[PDB]
Amino acid sequence: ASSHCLWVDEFAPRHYTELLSDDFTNRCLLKWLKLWDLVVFGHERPSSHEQVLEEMLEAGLDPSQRPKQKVALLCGPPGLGKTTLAHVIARHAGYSVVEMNASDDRSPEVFRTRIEAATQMESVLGAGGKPNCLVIDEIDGAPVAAINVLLSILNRKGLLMRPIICICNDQFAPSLRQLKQQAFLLHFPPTLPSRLVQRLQEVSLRQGMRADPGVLAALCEKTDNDIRACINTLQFLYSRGQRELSVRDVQATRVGLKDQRRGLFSVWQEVFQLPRASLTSASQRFYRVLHAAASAGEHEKVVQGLFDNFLRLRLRDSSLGAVCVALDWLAFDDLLAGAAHHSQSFQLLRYPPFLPVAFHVLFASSHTPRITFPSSQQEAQNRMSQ
Amino acid sequence: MFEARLVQGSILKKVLEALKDLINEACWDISSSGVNLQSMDSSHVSLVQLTLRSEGFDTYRCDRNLAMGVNLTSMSKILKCAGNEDIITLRAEDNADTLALVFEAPNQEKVSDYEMKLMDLDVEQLGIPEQEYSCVVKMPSGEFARICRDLSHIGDAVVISCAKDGVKFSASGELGNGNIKLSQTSNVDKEEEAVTIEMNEPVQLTFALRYLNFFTKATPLSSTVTLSMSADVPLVVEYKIADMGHLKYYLAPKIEDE
Amino acid sequence: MFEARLVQGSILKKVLEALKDLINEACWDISSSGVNLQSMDSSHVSLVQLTLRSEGFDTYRCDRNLAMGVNLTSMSKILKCAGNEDIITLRAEDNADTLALVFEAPNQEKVSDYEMKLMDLDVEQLGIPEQEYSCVVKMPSGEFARICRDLSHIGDAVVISCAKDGVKFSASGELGNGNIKLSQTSNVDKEEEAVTIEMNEPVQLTFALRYLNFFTKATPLSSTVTLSMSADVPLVVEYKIADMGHLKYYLAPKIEDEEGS
Amino acid sequence: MFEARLVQGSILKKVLEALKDLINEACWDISSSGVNLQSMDSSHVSLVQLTLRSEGFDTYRCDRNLAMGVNLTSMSKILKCAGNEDIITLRAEDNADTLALVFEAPNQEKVSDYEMKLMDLDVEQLGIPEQEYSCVVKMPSGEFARICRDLSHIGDAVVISCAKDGVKFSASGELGNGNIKLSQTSNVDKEEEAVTIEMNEPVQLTFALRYLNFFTKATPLSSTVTLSMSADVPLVVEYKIADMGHLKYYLAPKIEDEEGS
Amino acid sequence: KIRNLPWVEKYRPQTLNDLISHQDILSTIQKFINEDRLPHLLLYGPPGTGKTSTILACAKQLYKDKEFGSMVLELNASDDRGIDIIRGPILSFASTRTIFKKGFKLVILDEADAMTQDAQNALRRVIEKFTENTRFCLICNYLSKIIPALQSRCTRFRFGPLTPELMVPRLEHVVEEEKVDISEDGMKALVTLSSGDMRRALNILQSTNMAFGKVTEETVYTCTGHPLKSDIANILDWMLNQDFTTAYRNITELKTLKGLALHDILTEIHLFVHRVDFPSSVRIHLLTKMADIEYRLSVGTNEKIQLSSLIAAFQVTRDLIVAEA
Amino acid sequence: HYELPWVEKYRPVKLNEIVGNEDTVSRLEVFAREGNVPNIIIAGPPGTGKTTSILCLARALLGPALKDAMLELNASNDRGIDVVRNKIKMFAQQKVTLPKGRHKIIILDEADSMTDGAQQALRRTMEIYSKTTRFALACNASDKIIEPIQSRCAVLRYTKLTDAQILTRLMNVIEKERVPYTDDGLEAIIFTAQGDMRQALNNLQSTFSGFGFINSENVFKVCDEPHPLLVKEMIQHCVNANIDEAYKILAHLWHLGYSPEDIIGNIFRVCKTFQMAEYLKLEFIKEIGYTHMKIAEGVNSLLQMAGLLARLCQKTMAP
DNA sequence: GCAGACACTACGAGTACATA
DNA sequence: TTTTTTTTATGTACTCGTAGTGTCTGC
């Protein structure tokens, strides 16, 4: 069935030794799932960001013979292997994977009865049946009442006897904010380029296509360390007309270039800090900053971060002219928002995307600014409401 | 070429209403012996084993063994329009993507032909559930449905305890405690209401109410139901139909015993 | 002076509940022969031709011919609070805007005079061809409503065919197909439940289920409906009211293209 | 000391629902004759009087002429927790700043006490003239509620006319006029259905619809209703609630248009 | 018979031969109709140029009166045109055939710039899929409010402003049909104050004929309230030739005597400063100051202070122009 | 029968009749000949041939099973959260017998109109049933499609068609339709097309129906010259503080009947990608937004656009 | 003949967003 | 290597929860 399936499914890992994630996260998830071995399998013996995880793996158990963090929340950018890690780690620890993803109904009653089905009963095969590990994929799109249902099931003192592992893409969702305080938080770093280059070499040599490690490194750079996007791009670009991959096919924007939603701190860093030493022209930096600030989204938070961070830099303008024209640009955005929300004319909403890039023309430095998250406007509004 | 002429649509209606909210798919296995359906939930909570032999149909033609993976709701949509007492021709080809059902449901010579598209369901294999049950009792189906509804009125789960005496049902809630004690009811004229006990080694388990109600929704399918339960083996209810086959429901107990 | 008198209020309630989600506004054409209403739907796909005879009313007078365009949601709200056993008087003057509906309460004590304001729509008259149809089928209205409701669960567009054998309905949907074929059901004790075939040439045409389900709401008006079909003229649903008049529904076929292959 | 007992709990459970969205507070005046409530609405249009005599209570203790002021946003939630056929006791001390309502739980196993803070409101009695009205009529209560509800779908304001023929309700809107009349209903078995006329001078006044619907929210308290009108006096809607007392509603008319020449 | 109608509705070009200006576009659309090759049309332009009249004349030419209600679906901004309407009545009208007689149907979407972009995105495959069965005509004034996917699917005709040379014979036809005594200066004033818009030409003609009984230059400029060219030339000469006080007194007396408004004075002075050979630094300052004054007149501001600022904007540049030499 | 317009009559039915984007179209030809095509999202300008390429690929892959092995959904369909859960997933689960290397194809045309939740529900039914069904999405704005869907598909990006690529298809249509022409008329059709094959075919059909001959005068009598190439000269004049020529271009655009909103939109679109100083570009964009607020308020005259041009000329001579 | 239960659509309500 | 919240004023669109209500089953 070589001509029947995708290369992302033909080269999917079927064992723990074939995973492409960070080894620390794999070991932490496996140790967290083996902390359930006493309650689930009835056996005493199973066979910085790192420091908190290693402490919570060695923190012990509650007197109900369970981990005190009963939910493992998995976070990261798309295409890293989070679903693959959850399924491989669950099938490796003797469990049976029960999936509940975003393609289901996700109403607070259907979510409730599906969790009660998945976790509150034993196997219908009797003895020898594998336990159920409830994998909840795409929890960041669930409503807040579904998260409340999940937490009420998690905090019944009706006792939860089976592990639950949740997978999300953005950990800072407003529906998961109570979950992060209660979950074994595993954040996925981007995959190592050398490991992905070696894996793409293995895939291309299995498919009989020749490629240098340089063009595969360029493809990994293009797709922002996405395994699935790189393998799909190789599957399209190889075909069977030609054998050897060319560097200009990867360098071209026709195949393999997808839109990446930028983080807020990455956008503030690329606005305030110049790139380190082509790309040295000011026009390319102008267009790059404009497109990154447009592709991030959440425009009001970007404006608040610019307003709260631009006076904390090592500003070279001692005459305060750059600060004055930046405040003029901020007042320009505010007037545009007011006029668009007053006259119902939202074609005025194409100019405030040029507010961040103006800051990039004003306060771009070669230093390393410590960008903080904006809180002053929201704290002031809450205090004014009080 | 597969043809099965079910003599009455009542049994098909009661089966597809019994497992309407129970299983998400129907996997009909077609052989020369009859039609088999061994389906399991995705969370491994309930199991359905339905067998309809070839003698229970008006006709039965089966050239090759077939696997009909079909949607539950798409067939409930069909037999919401079927007839209670009418002949139902369930037919399919050897290598086809469709499954046809021909009937004359309103008794008004209204020739209805309803087709379905198959589901491509992965071939999971469940060979034989082991049957070495210590406690085998017999009960009427209607009284079981009534007591399951009475438990559903109060609680959310049933504590079921077998005994040489009979089967005790318990349920607890904030409103109150619902409890009955089954007695020997063999001194009646009806043979369906007689409770026959062939048990040893009494077992007390806890089961979900919703799956028990879905199992006992098949009360008019058979007059008498058989209960088979033991320690660490899931509970079986069994409806023996009169001439077509039999139906087995398997329910896994709760982890929190008592 | 226009003054019609519906002998009971149930027929007007059934008519205005059949057309409520279909007809935008009611154009009552008034003459000495009776009351005519030829109105298209909001989508300009269906057509409604209602003809009420002068002999069906209690008292009917009409000096000069009128053409009253009135709103339908207002008339629906008027006819909602109307009885099924009481006389309803429709009044209209020569050069006024008040179309008066005069009836009694369900308590049967107090009068109720509900005026409506006439509209100015001056729409051009649509010509009914009144030609012969290649298929005429007499069938009960309840069976037609039941088969349209059963075909609405499978698909959205229904291929209806008619031949020498009988009328056939097909709904190729997402679950699958539903093919219901009924013929020669005249061998019952009732007279309304019968399927009769009058004309010759077989026709297969596809129609929307929403408009057919809207047309089936005239089931309490007539026990037996007539279906007229041909390859060029549209589908006609003809309800023959017992002693008041008749109602014709015209539905255009959908555009279907075969596969190039 | 104020200490009163009711004979039926449905009196409060039918009289506070009309005052739920009509008036913002309930001011009770305590005297030896009974309890008197005179409350004007926030828009200065409606005026509610409620006089329940001391002969209708199960017991009644009143030493000093006191006035209590309670809110509606808490009493409406408290009243829904109470029963229907139980007994309600109202208690108020001489110097305390709370009003206690003691009744039976709907489970009929425990006694429920609810306390409400006394709002110290500074009002003055407006003073009804109690003059001779130019029109007095008697109507059924539920029929008047159905009449006020049927004009809600037509216009935002109603017109009440009262000649010697009877009482005419009109509702002129963008849809069309809705006119209903009631006259000479003395030939019925029920005494509460007697639509009668009592005065001579005809009156035609335009009133609001929302306030009349709020007035007809208190219909099953009494059997009949009374309507009093004059040329400039506001509309008086009188309910004779059983034996303990009566209720009066005052509704001001609208400003008439400039139809002069 | 006679009717009580406005002259922009009493005189509507029911046929394509009665429209005056866009002769190549109308010839192409007439050859579209005659060859039975009518595409999806996109008529865009300034108001009062005859786009709705064009599509109504085409609909009356294509279809008879006995079948017009079954072939044409006309929707405008007064109707609900949400995405439920595109998926509902419009899609059912497109996907079904006719009732009485065979033919292709016509969906007219007047004022299509007022449609939401969800409805415009739902329109795309309705237009593309049922091209043989039904035709679509979008009419707009702003082309930027229609998505580029809908602009690709329709052939677009720009109905530009009506030139005053071709505007005269239609106005002469309306004048002869209404028994109006008009001079040549009155017709010149009509085609000047209309500015490529037959609606305002007919409205000003009807208003002047009702107010005065004759249509001359004085009657048109009195009924409209517009200042004459000599008044604007006098205002510019006073602003450029003498001091602040004398120019202020003369302009104030001219505005009080003739009842002029500052918006039209600003418009005509803006038209005049591009004709006067100013230096480029003077012209930029004058344009900026006059745009500021025109923006200040859009709210509750005293017109006397704005008139003084209009005088000030030229009293600043007088010395600069003279010292430039 | 009614003859289709040349956009719909001369829609390509094979993948080798599609001009432009030669490498991507050639790889789609290889995939249509062989099979086992990955999930695909085609993005690009309108009129490039994305729907044509997807439909031709689906037809060439499926053959006679196109009626039962393809699910085509548009923005004219519902395709909300309840349709991705119930209809798309049931089609992905549906058994369809196909030859080797061929899968079911769920064409989701114009995928920008789908909401975020429907695209979130699309992810797991894309990933699970990939051995039996495939996805072919077409879009204009690729940022409207979320990043999990773009990771689950091969993102092909179509570029705007060049002059020779449209000229080859125009020569094919002209030789099919026996249309007389000159080279200048075809150059004018290319000029009015602006990289759009739909507009090229529409303008060719309009000119041939109206006049019967394709020279520059007959094209420009019915079609129109493009806006931003003329706006760019005015912006270049405003950069050099030349107010007279900028007002000449502005008054020429005003007398053509263009509204102030279209003119200021073209001015902003030119000033986004203009070649000048970045701080001067930001000053220009801020002045354009300040004028556009006045346009949206209600004051939209020729004097306001002239004041905008004067302020843009002031921004040059104000360091 | 009349009470209990089933699904049906209409309607209330919360939320997001609107540009290139 | 750094995260909590409701304002902008309409119009539209989507999604979900709730409530009359027509009709079927049963003793």
Ligand SMILES: Nc1ncnc2c1ncn2[C@@H]1O[C@H](COP(=O)(O)OP(=O)(O)OP(O)(O)=S)[C@@H](O)[C@H]1O
């Ligand atoms: N070691 C590996 N070698 C090759 N392919 C792999 C490997 N690990 C994972 N993959 C594939 O790469 C993809 C990983 O993405 P998934 O784990 O399925 O989803 P995800 O990582 O959670 O990202 P999102 O947010 O769901 S898009 C899948 O298509 C896997 O089959």
Ligand SMILES: Nc1ncnc2c1ncn2[C@@H]1O[C@H](COP(=O)(O)OP(=O)(O)OP(O)(O)=S)[C@@H](O)[C@H]1O
């Ligand atoms: N070209 C024309 N020839 C003759 N009369 C015209 C012409 N254009 C406009 N008119 C007159 O102006 C009236 C209105 O013109 P319309 O056809 O409505 O123009 P329009 O382009 O639709 O304007 P908008 O954009 O809808 S406000 C017509 O009824 C005619 O009386």
Ligand SMILES: Nc1ncnc2c1ncn2[C@@H]1O[C@H](COP(=O)(O)OP(=O)(O)OP(O)(O)=S)[C@@H](O)[C@H]1O
């Ligand atoms: N590359 C091309 N080669 C040949 N004809 C083309 C090409 N692109 C477009 N066309 C023609 O233009 C018509 C429209 O093409 P489509 O593929 O529907 O446009 P599109 O690429 O989908 O752009 P949008 O975003 O859907 S408006 C086709 O029917 C062809 O007649």
Ligand SMILES: [Mg+2]
């Ligand atoms: Mg995943």
Ligand SMILES: [Mg+2]
């Ligand atoms: Mg118009």
Ligand SMILES: [Mg+2]
């Ligand atoms: Mg397309």
